[PDB]
Amino acid sequence: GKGKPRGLNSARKLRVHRRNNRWAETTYKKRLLGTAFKSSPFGGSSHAKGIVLEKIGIESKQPNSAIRKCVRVQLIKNGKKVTAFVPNDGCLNFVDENDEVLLAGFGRKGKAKGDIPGVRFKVVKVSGVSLLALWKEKKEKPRS
Amino acid sequence: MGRMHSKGKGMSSSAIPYSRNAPAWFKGSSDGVVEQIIKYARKGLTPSQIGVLLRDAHGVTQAKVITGNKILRILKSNGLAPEIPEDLYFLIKKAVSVRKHLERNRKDKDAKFRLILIESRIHRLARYYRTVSVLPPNWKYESATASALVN
Amino acid sequence: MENDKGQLVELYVPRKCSATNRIIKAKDHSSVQINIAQVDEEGRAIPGEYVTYALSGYIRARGEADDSLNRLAQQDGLLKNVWSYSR
Amino acid sequence: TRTSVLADALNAINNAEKTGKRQVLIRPSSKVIIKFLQVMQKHGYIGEFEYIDDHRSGKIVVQLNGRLNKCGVISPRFNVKIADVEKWTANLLPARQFGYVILTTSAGIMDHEEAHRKHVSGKILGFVY
Amino acid sequence: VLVQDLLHPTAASEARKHKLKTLVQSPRSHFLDVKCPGCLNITTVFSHAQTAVTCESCSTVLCTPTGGKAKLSEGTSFRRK
Amino acid sequence: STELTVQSERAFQKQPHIFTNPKAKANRKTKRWYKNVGLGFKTPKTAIEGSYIDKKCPFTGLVSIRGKILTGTVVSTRMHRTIVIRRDYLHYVPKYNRYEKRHKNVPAHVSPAFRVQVGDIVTVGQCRPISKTVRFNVLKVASATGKANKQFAKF
Amino acid sequence: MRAKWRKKRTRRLKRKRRKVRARSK
RNA sequence: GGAUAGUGGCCUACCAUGGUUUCAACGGGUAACGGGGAAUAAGGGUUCGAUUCCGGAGAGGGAGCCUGAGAAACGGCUACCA
RNA sequence: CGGUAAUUCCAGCUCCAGUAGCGUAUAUUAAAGUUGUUGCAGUUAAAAAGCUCGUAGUUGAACUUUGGGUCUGGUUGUCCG
RNA sequence: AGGACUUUUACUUUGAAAAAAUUAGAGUGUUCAAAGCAGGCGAAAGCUCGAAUAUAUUAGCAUGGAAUAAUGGAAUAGGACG
RNA sequence: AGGGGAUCGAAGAUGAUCAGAUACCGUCGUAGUCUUAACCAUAAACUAUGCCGACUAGGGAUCGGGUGGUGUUUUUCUUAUGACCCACUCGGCACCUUACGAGAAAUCAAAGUCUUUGGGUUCUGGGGGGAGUAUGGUCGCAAGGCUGAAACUUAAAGGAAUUG
Numbered sequence A: 001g002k003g004k005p006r007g008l009n010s011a012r013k014l015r016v017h018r019r020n021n022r023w024a025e026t027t028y029k030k031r032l033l034g035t036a037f038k039s040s041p042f043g044g045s046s047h048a049k050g051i052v053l054e055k056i057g058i059e060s061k062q063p064n065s066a067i068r069k070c071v072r073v074q075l076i077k078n079g080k081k082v083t084a085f086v087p088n089d090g091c092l093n094f095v096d097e098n099d100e101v102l103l104a105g106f107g108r109k110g111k112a113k114g115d116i117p118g119v120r121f122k123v124v125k126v127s128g129v130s131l132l133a134l135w136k137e138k139k140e141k142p143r144s
Numbered sequence B: 001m002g003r004m005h006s007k008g009k010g011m012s013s014s015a016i017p018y019s020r021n022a023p024a025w026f027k028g029s030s031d032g033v034v035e036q037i038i039k040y041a042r043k044g045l046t047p048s049q050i051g052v053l054l055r056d057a058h059g060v061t062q063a064k065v066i067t068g069n070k071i072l073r074i075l076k077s078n079g080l081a082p083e084i085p086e087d088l089y090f091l092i093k094k095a096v097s098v099r100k101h102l103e104r105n106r107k108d109k110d111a112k113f114r115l116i117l118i119e120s121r122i123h124r125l126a127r128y129y130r131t132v133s134v135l136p137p138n139w140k141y142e143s144a145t146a147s148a149l150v151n
Numbered sequence C: 001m002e003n004d005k006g007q008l009v010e011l012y013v014p015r016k017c018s019a020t021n022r023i024i025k026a027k028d029h030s031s032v033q034i035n036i037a038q039v040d041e042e043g044r045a046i047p048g049e050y051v052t053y054a055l056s057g058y059i060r061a062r063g064e065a066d067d068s069l070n071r072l073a074q075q076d077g078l079l080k081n082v083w084s085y086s087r
Numbered sequence D: 001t002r003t004s005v006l007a008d009a010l011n012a013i014n015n016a017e018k019t020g021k022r023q024v025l026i027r028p029s030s031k032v033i034i035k036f037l038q039v040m041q042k043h044g045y046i047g048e049f050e051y052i053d054d055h056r057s058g059k060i061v062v063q064l065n066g067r068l069n070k071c072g073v074i075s076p077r078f079n080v081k082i083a084d085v086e087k088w089t090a091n092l093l094p095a096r097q098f099g100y101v102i103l104t105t106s107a108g109i110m111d112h113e114e115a116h117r118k119h120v121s122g123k124i125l126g127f128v129y
Numbered sequence E: 001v002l003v004q005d006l007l008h009p010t011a012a013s014e015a016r017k018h019k020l021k022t023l024v025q026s027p028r029s030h031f032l033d034v035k036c037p038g039c040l041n042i043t044t045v046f047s048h049a050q051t052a053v054t055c056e057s058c059s060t061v062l063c064t065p066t067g068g069k070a071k072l073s074e075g076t077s078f079r080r081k
Numbered sequence F: 001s002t003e004l005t006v007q008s009e010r011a012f013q014k015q016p017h018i019f020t021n022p023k024a025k026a027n028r029k030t031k032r033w034y035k036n037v038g039l040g041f042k043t044p045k046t047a048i049e050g051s052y053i054d055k056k057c058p059f060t061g062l063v064s065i066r067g068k069i070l071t072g073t074v075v076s077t078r079m080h081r082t083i084v085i086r087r088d089y090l091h092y093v094p095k096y097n098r099y100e101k102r103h104k105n106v107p108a109h110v111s112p113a114f115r116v117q118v119g120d121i122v123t124v125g126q127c128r129p130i131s132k133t134v135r136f137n138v139l140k141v142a143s144a145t146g147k148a149n150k151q152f153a154k155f
Numbered sequence G: 001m002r003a004k005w006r007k008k009r010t011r012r013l014k015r016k017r018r019k020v021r022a023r024s025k
Numbered sequence H: 001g002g003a004u005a006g007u008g009g010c011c012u013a014c015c016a017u018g019g020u021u022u023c024a025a026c027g028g029g030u031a032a033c034g035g036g037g038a039a040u041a042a043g044g045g046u047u048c049g050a051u052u053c054c055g056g057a058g059a060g061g062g063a064g065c066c067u068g069a070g071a072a073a074c075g076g077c078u079a080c081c082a
Numbered sequence I: 001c002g003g004u005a006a007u008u009c010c011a012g013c014u015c016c017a018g019u020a021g022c023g024u025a026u027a028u029u030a031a032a033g034u035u036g037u038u039g040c041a042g043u044u045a046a047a048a049a050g051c052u053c054g055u056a057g058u059u060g061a062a063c064u065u066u067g068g069g070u071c072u073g074g075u076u077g078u079c080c081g
Numbered sequence J: 001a002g003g004a005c006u007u008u009u010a011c012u013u014u015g016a017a018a019a020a021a022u023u024a025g026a027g028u029g030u031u032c033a034a035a036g037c038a039g040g041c042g043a044a045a046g047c048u049c050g051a052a053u054a055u056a057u058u059a060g061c062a063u064g065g066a067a068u069a070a071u072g073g074a075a076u077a078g079g080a081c082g
Numbered sequence K: 001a002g003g004g005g006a007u008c009g010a011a012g013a014u015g016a017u018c019a020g021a022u023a024c025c026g027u028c029g030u031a032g033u034c035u036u037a038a039c040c041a042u043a044a045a046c047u048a049u050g051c052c053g054a055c056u057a058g059g060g061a062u063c064g065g066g067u068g069g070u071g072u073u074u075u076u077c078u079u080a081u082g083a084c085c086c087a088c089u090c091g092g093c094a095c096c097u098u099a100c101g102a103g104a105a106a107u108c109a110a111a112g113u114c115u116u117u118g119g120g121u122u123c124u125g126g127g128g129g130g131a132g133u134a135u136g137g138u139c140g141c142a143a144g145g146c147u148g149a150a151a152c153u154u155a156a157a158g159g160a161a162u163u164g
Ligand SMILES: [Mg+2]
Pocket: H032, H049
């Protein structure tokens, strides 16, 4: 009738067929190969600290004309270097060069979000304090 | 309509009549029929030709209807059943003929493929006859030894 | 169909095809209901008294409406040997 | 190759019912087909069938009355524990008020309600409703 | 067609259909009693014979193999069995 | 696969602590000790009057049969004084409600009292660890041949 | 581009890489 | 035969050449301790289970051992490596 | 959305959702009939090996006591005590 | 309760087993609930009901059934009984 | 590799067309096309429809075989053939109509008998690109064949049809 066998003693080929087909997915292949630990900037890590190397801005795509204020950060856990996004309006000046910054995911499963090219990480905390608390003047940078 | 080794789908066959018992018009004796079968076998005839002869020249519809036993069974009861069953023997005969044709001309590839088909059929039938112990368990078909069985 | 008290709750029992016993949909806009007039001794069609056959839309679309009506009328003593049960 | 003969019988019944006929000619006619059609008769989904001796596995002529709407075999005759009967009835039958999962028990081929009455269960053959 | 007998179809329809396809499948062949002008022996032959059947008394063929059924000789007279 | 000599090796082969007195003049063959393993298992007559020794005989040796009783089919009789039995079964994968043909290879120790060959179905019984891998002693050769009981054909 | 000519360009790149490897094998 | 508390290639001596494997052996990976269980929930399932209970293993990595009924113990010793 | 009237950016006003909780990140489950044994698709959307043979695997025609009669035990709905 | 032969399975019903905690779930005004396995009733003069059950779908053991699915008999009779 | 060596024609040689034209038009023209051995194993190797099996609907034709005609010409006096004509049947490449079934539709008599979901069975796919690439095997003299990812990037790519 259908491609799969149906006999009462065909459990083996059904199981191995499903097991061979499961590699067609992306989530299953990533989970079993464990590419997150080996290749991604973080190994299965929601957040990671890093050191700001320099202070760059990156232009947007065609339909959106602007320059999103980014920052190049070298991760401390392993030494990789990644660009990250300083989210809000007047937060670029808040983060100074060569200060510890806690990058987080960008919410799109490790893929570039919106019109910002070649970035995959937000910025949540700088120098131990959070950017959202600075942006509403609830706390101030310790300046150490 | 299967045609194991080709794309054929025919169903040309023979319909055995419903009545198993002897036909009303048949006057011959079962003992005479068995004697006729024995004589035909002693002439050196396979059971199929025996059935053909009994159907054409005589009123024997089929042996099982008249006697109660089959032709090969009747021969086996008297010990005239060949060591190699008839269909397998004819398969080896055909295979050796095609192999002869091949070794006499190499470039014919279609007959090479047909020989492959015939050898596959021979292997299947040999496996069957081996699982019923008609043939010894050491019996096998080999290209070099087929001629001796045919000859 | 039947409430535990025994009172009917169905909106309406649908008609069924008199030839295939299949029910007739409410919006089955191909099915027909034939009326055949009863005939008295002198060939006068008695008015208001007849026999009805509900042929479904399916058989009509298939092409077997007339054959089914032939058989159905032959069974109830309307036509003489117009339909043979053995083809 | 005809593997599941009951499958051929029920498929022929379904085809000859959907087209609206009142008769079917099932060719191979085993025990299981006879018992299946006998259960269908007992519950009325079928009419008045008939076995035609061939000396050759026989045949069957089945009379219908349009009361049936679908037969069907569960081709792998799954071992059905007495707990899983309700699961099959939910997955196959359209409503709990009717329909019958015809299943083969050690006490013969029976509808699921009768098997539940005997408190015995076996393999599943098919379903009728 | 919608309602129709299969248990008792018309015998004309029986001869219409193919062998192996009737209600009960029965052969269309039959046997014959042939007499050759030579002797008075009556020989029983098959309609679809496959061999050059001869009377045992005389080496004269009574049938001839053919793609279908037997083609009898010129002067042999037969009666259907 | 059995030597004609009743002892062939360097060490003498005796059943330990059963002694035949030569000073006595009964002069029977020997004093052969034996036992029945129970469970309604008939000790073979080939063991009852045999002359083998087989320390690990369930019927004549010190080993006792207790525990599992497994029926299987012989798959290898061609390693000395021991058998390799193929046990087939069906594992039930529940995610599919389907079974799965599977096989295990159980070594065992067949006594010389039994005549085994490739293909005989065998009833075998648990015992002490006899070797690194054998833990079962052959207790019955149910199918001596199976389909070779009748071999020739002479009408 | 056609898949044919992309394939051919890939084959020519393999040509260059194969001769380079053969010279240094 | 030795050793074992005791069966056992557990070790030795002499023999036999055997055992597993397409029903996946062997090898590789596991950001794998196993399980009772957790999340999830029409039904079938998918993922997790380092951790309150049961087992196993370990005391920096390795080996070796006294005492005792019980340790190859490490809040017991001996030695090497770090 | 933002290129001079921004219902989307920064604010004020009003309102909405959850509320001592709410927002984000990664992972995962249901949604996923997008893993499909129940339960997926293969003409053109991704996908029928160029075709045939063939070991293992999977699967494999029908047929071997069906009826009846009685007695009898529980459980029901019975009619009422 | 003893000798005797036991075709073998697959399947399915029932039972013994599958530790507690967990899940399900009975009883119970922790002030309700999460919970907990408590508590309740006397006249106040000691009298008390509890701490229920089910499931685990695999492997093993026993048991009733014999449809479905498979194997085996007697063909050289070396067959069965007296 | 050996044989041939007509035609046509990768490369090449030119003569044109053009802004360029070592492209299309034209004239010559090696390798090749043709073969005997040995390799190659790929094609839009397409019916882009796996194989076996069952059933479901009307209409004609066509190929191979077989049955019957109180059929017609055939001529060898009659007949036997053969060749047609009519009817039927089996098998094959096919075709027309239709939806009462199926599909996203184009359409399909199978692409039907599938939410009323289970006849047996093999292979393949899980958004696009990277990419049938790299690497590692394996086959090959070579060409290349078989097996065959990821990093990363992307909100689409794509199918059928409707109006412009
Ligand atoms: Mg774990």
